[PDB]
Swiss-Prot record:
Superkingdom of this protein's organism: Bacteria
Name listed for the protein in its UniProt record: Thioredoxin 1
Gene that this sequence comes from: trxA
Similarity annotation: Belongs to the thioredoxin family.
Site (Deprotonates C-terminal active site Cys): 24
UniProt keyword annotations, A-Z: Acetylation, Disulfide bond, Electron transport, Redox-active center, Transport
Amino acid sequence: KIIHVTDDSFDTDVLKADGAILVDFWAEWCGPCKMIAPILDEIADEYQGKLTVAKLNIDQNPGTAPKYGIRGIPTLLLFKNGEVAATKVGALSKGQLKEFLDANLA
């Protein structure tokens, strides 16, 4: 359900994707990241059909993050039509994520 993205499949899975894609940039050592992982799993269920959730481990895929000016994690990028539509840095509750999503999905 949650796309496992890599440095090699980013361009095709995200840039050429047709729809709204939410990309989660994390790393095993990033606590705040591990804190919102459960929330993404649930968001994928509540937004099935109008949103696709993907995740990119920066340690294993150290190339993509820099091209998008990502200065730290956790950081979420909402791609729309092949381009960044909205950005969100830091951990957040279930509510803050839904409000952010509802407002930028319309």
